[PDB]
Amino acid sequence: EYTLEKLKDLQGFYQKQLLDDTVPFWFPRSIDREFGGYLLMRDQDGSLIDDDKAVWIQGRAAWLLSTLYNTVEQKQEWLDGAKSGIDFLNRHCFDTDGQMFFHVTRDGQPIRKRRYYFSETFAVIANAAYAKASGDEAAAKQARYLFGKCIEYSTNPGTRPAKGIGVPMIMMNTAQQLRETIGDPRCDEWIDKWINEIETYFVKDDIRCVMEQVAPDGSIIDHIDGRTLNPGHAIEGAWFILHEAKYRNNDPRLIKLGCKMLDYMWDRGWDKEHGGILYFRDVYNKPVQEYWQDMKFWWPHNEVIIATLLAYTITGEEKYAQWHKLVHEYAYQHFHDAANGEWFGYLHKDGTLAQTAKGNLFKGPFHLPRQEWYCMTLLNEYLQQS
Amino acid sequence: EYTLEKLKDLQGFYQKQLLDDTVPFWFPRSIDREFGGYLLMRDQDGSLIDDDKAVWIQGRAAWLLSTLYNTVEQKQEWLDGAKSGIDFLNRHCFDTDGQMFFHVTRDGQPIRKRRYYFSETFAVIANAAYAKASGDEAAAKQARYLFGKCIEYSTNPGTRPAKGIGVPMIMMNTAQQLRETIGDPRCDEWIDKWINEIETYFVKDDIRCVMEQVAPDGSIIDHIDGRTLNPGHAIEGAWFILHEAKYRNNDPRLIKLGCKMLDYMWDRGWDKEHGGILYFRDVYNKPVQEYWQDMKFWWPHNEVIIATLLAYTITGEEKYAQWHKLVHEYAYQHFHDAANGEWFGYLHKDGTLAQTAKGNLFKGPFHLPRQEWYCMTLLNEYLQQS
Ligand SMILES: [Cl-]
């Protein structure tokens, strides 16, 4: 049972991990004093395995430092750290056609450019949070400008057309962060549209499933890619929705939507043999072909930790406390590196470490610190209401 | 280690496995009578997980059926099966610009097109082998035309330029198969160039390594991708070169080159804790970031089985017999499905099955039947020399 006492202990646990373990692993040592931005591709002991810079993570790291400055402690070095990432994005991470790169060298030369625009969304939330921390009007203007571009990209884009849940999900969280930092009048109405898109097209009540992609009419694509589910990704969307429910005075309709997405994908995603959240599943339980389908990655566990704790504090249903205990204990016992700090990223299905790196092209200071920060803040709010 | 009687038993094993286990799992049942080509995305029990068609594998399967017709038995059903795939490639798998698709639906509608010319290389070997089996001059002309387009691209295949060993390797095998079926005056000279490219740029004697990618001057790219090695892929190239050595009157330079590459990458690739060939390694033993780096895939074992047995027959060095015994026993014990036939594709590092499928977008009737066919043929020739 999750008593107020137990929740007080959890609150302090997440706060301690975030500020004494997770953040100090990255900062300030990751600040690139020569070229700006952050050097984040680090091995278990903090040594660099690469000096390249993932553009998504540059924005995510700048967003995190600004968010800590805004909501934890106005530490100058966090503000200076955030600005370094903001400046690096503006100086080096935009191609001549206006689209952002995905992967650049230490000194900002382009390695790869992806068609999509997730790079832009993370620049939005970085600039929005930094603008609030610093009062920089150029960053606020940039955040709103890029937000409008992302809205256009999402509405004005192979004989098998598919739509992905990732677009409405990322745009929803981008809009939420923009709203909660500097504000934008478009946030609420577009969040409504993206929630409706998730509910209408991707949430399947008859088979108790949340899809990753569907046909334009919402139907299931009964092929290898179309059948492939990502439980952690669906549950990330679930807590985005629960977060919106909380913002809207605990809107019961959004609570039911968020909770059933969580219920559906916990059942499909939790590994009953070894524990943990499996990376991919198949809607019809056909063999999943993506090679890492049964691996245990860090970030699905971060998102399910948030979602279960948030669902519990909203609904008081003890099952979400039980699920939270399971995923919390599994994740901190399997991913956390007590020796060097932070979390390993990649475990085999059975929980054994696959490789020792803690940052790369995809992992950095985002999913874990966000989870510890969100849970710390959530429980502080919850406990000061009781 | 290996007596003549033991080699005779091995010859029969590969022959019976090929003809009574591997080929029957696929054919004739995979021949798509209604739409042409082959339905190859099959679960462990032979049932389809998808009716899509991977263009590479359509060509590979047509090549296999023609090769069995040409070198094993002139079975009409194999010739007809080959023709079905050749016709399917010509009818559906070329775009209007003359470039081949990568992924099509059952009825031939395009799903993905890759800038690649790798689909074309498999169309070359498919058409060349089919041309020899059937006497079809059109297929011969197409094989020789596309071979030239492939050479064209191979000579000209973005701040971090890299070249990959896959290009010279795949072109070498394409040229070898063209030579051994219908012939082409370009084969020998271009194989010489591709071998020289592999030796000059990718084989690193001082560190006993074969690279996957290097910079244009041959230098190692000391970043995550540039450091990533694929031992099975390197050993595939090693036996292509040993194969060429035999054709060139057992050329000592080529024997030494092929063996060196095999020696280097067996040492780096063989998993001493759990057995089997690891998928990826890192040239400086940094953690490999690609998620499936420590998984045990079917096809590296196929290629290493060929290379060790071929190296043993060419050099008489007992160590290659010892390595062949290790990888042969490992692979057949862990991948072969004695109940339903053929091989699983994907094991965890520790050898446990990751998923049950036997065909998908990448696995089909190619690496395994080629290995059993090649080893059966090799041993037949070797034993009649003894
Ligand atoms: Cl992350």
Ligand SMILES: [Cl-]
């Ligand atoms: Cl294959």
